[PDB]
Design a protein around this ligand. Structure first.
Ligand SMILES: Nc1ncnc2c1ncn2[C@@H]1O[C@H](COP(=O)(O)OP(=O)(O)OP(=O)(O)O)[C@@H](O)[C@H]1O
Lengths: 304, 134, 159
């Protein structure tokens, strides 16, 4: 605090942190001291060290049952480091832990913006099977639907279909002036570079989401139809399909010269195709046979 | 497990050597009460110790007093239990001993007159000279 | 070190060639820094010769490579990163600033022509994988190359 510290002074305390971890056990005060240096490490600008010392904090968890409530307020410092560079998914599960601080509140504005902060990262996170059941835990809550933008958010997820992206910007472009709560848009659009990266992120998510229904419904499509469907040039579609094909999330062959493009159908020349298809379909009426049998058997014994 | 050592008081009556006692008190008692201090430094707790005489005396007394001072568990073995006449299986009875040493732990084990059962097989001869080597 | 150089001109064994440079660095360690900093260039480059860029980052991430980190280890990491990303434009952009470290390569023609012959199909596997039927003229615009040698290289890929 004397010289306000710098890259070197913050490094002097670094090597001294772990000296007393194994020396003695201190419940509260030590924890408060061990988080003091990373908030200076943000000013050091060196992140690779900040994540190491932050990796020493997780082995101290779970810190609950002591403090309660202060250390729950420190997660607000950790999300700052995780949200910064490479991971949008690392804040996903941790913002549900920063959602436990307004649980004790006794506060409305902080809590009301906690809900939007926890609900809006679904788009920023790349789609995964863990995300699917993640959003179902928060859905159905009694406090969550209080936000009208939440109904738009949910509408894009449930059963997909299609929507105009500019009309999406009609709902999400008002939230900058709207509020009440401007904090989520303060994180997104606060930095011009951050806001632009999440604009291209939202675009990547909606165009990736339009694709996965096309993957189930094709069969085939004309190339020029996908352009007017996604409201972008065919060159942009080429870029998009290049990243989707290298992600090998869905196999496709999209011919540009002849205009015929399609996702799947999988080849399956002979064996497995006819096997599973023909046989299981035939077993349908076979296993259902005995099922309706007893249905008529009970109906005829009810009246006779 | 039925060995009985009086004192307590007998531990206070032995006198010398003070600093030797201050070594054994630590090497014996500390690893049990404060295992945490060892893991910090990285030093392994000593698993064995050698007390020999008789340049003077007091070997067996002192250690025996520690049995009754530290309390906990104590195990005494006389050196005559290694022979077992034919079939020197008592060697495997050492594995039994360390079995229940791993169960009833912590415990203290005494070995007296080890020279008979820990000799050097220098001159190869007779018979039982070898079994002890086993 | 010399065993490594001769094996690099022989090109017969690309495995033990990395072993020799590794042991040589173990000798130069803790005594002479200038030999230790120049020893990593050859081992990592020979690992790029083996077309395994993923292990390069793992070697430079250790505590032993952090003390010896410098302007050369970033030139090794950028070749590993361009081979992993499979982009010749990034490779050439970084090739100008690191040319000072590129001149220390005893043979600049071998490694660069073999890597170019490699990155050719590493750029082709991105354009070919999405669709089977492809025109030559529009796909040659991505790699920015005449169609003649391209068709020659593709037919070679069939062979
Ligand atoms: N420090 C001591 N205080 C009190 N009595 C002692 C002490 N040292 C020895 N003695 C006496 O000596 C006897 C045996 O003790 P100790 O185990 O030292 O003998 P020892 O080691 O078998 O001797 P040696 O090794 O010569 O056979 C005890 O009965 C005890 O009365």
């Amino acid at each position: 605090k004397e010289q306000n510290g710098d890259v070197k002074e913050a490094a002097s305390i670094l090597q001294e942190l772990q000296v007393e971890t194994y020396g003695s056990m201190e419940k509260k005060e030590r924890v408060e001291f061990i988080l003091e240096q990373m908030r200076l490490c943000l000013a050091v600008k060196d992140y690779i060290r900040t994540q190491i010392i932050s990796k020493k904090i997780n082995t101290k968890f779970f810190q609950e049952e002591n403090t309660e409530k202060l250390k729950l307020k420190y997660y607000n410092l950790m999300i700052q480091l995780d949200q910064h560079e490479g991971s949008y998914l690392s804040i996903c599960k941790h913002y549900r832990a920063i959602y436990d601080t307004p649980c004790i509140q006794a506060e409305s504005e902080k809590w009301q913006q906690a809900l939007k902060s926890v609900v809006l990262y679904v788009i920023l996170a790349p789609f995964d099977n863990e995300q699917s059941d993640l959003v179902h835990r928060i859905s159905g809550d009694k406090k969550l639907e209080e936000i009208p933008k939440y109904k738009d958010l949910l509408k894009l997820f449930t059963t997909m279909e299609l929507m105009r992206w500019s009309t999406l910007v009609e709902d999400y472009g008002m939230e900058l002036r709207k509020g009440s709560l401007e904090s989520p848009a303060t994180d997104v659009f606060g930095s011009t570079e951050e806001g632009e990266k999440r604009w291209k992120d939202l675009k990547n998510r909606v165009v990736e989401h339009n694709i996965r229904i096309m993957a189930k419904y094709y069969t085939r499509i004309t190339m020029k139809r996908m352009a007017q469907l996604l409201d972008l040039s065919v060159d942009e579609s080429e870029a998009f399909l290049s990243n989707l094909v290298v992600n090998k999330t869905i196999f496709a062959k999209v011919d540009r010269l002849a205009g015929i493009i399609n996702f799947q159908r999988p080849k399956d020349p002979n064996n497995l195709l006819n096997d599973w298809s023909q046989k299981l379909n035939s077993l349908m009426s076979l296993v259902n046979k005995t099922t309706h049998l007893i249905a008529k058997e009970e109906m005829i014994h009810n009246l006779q | 497990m039925s060995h009985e050592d009086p004192g307590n008081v007998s531990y206070s009556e032995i006198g010398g050597l003070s600093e030797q006692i201050r070594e054994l008190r630590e090497v014996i008692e500390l690893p049990l009460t404060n295992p945490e201090l060892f893991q910090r430094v990285g030093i392994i707790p000593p698993k064995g110790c050698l007390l020999y005489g008789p340049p003077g005396t007091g070997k067996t007394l002192l250690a025996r007093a520690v049995a009754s001072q530290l309390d906990c568990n104590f195990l005494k073995v006389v050196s005559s239990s290694i022979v077992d006449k034919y079939i020197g299986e008592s060697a495997r009875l050492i594995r039994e001993m360390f079995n229940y040493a791993r169960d009833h732990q912590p415990c203290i084990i005494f070995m007296d007159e080890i020279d008979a059962i820990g000799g050097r097989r220098f001159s190869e001869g007779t018979s039982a000279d070898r079994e002890i080597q086993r | 070190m010399q065993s490594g150089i001769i094996h690099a001109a022989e090109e017969k064994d690309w495995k033990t060639a990395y072993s020799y440079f590794y042991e040589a660095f173990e000798g130069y360690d803790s005594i002479d820094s200038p030999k230790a900093i120049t020893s990593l260039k050859y081992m990592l480059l020979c690992k790029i010769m083996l077309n395994t860029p993923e292990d390069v980052q793992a070697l430079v991430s250790g505590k032993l490579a952090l003390r010896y980190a410098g302007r050369q280890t970033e030139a090794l990491k950028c070749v590993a990163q361009a081979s992993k990303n499979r982009s010749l434009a990034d490779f050439e952009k970084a090739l100008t600033d690191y040319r000072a470290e590129l001149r220390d390569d005893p043979i600049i023609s071998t490694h660069l022509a073999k890597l170019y012959d490699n990155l050719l199909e590493q750029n082709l596997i991105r354009v070919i994988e999405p669709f089977s039927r492809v025109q030559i003229e529009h796909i040659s615009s991505l790699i920015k190359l005449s169609k003649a040698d391209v068709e020659r290289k593709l037919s070679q890929m069939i062979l």
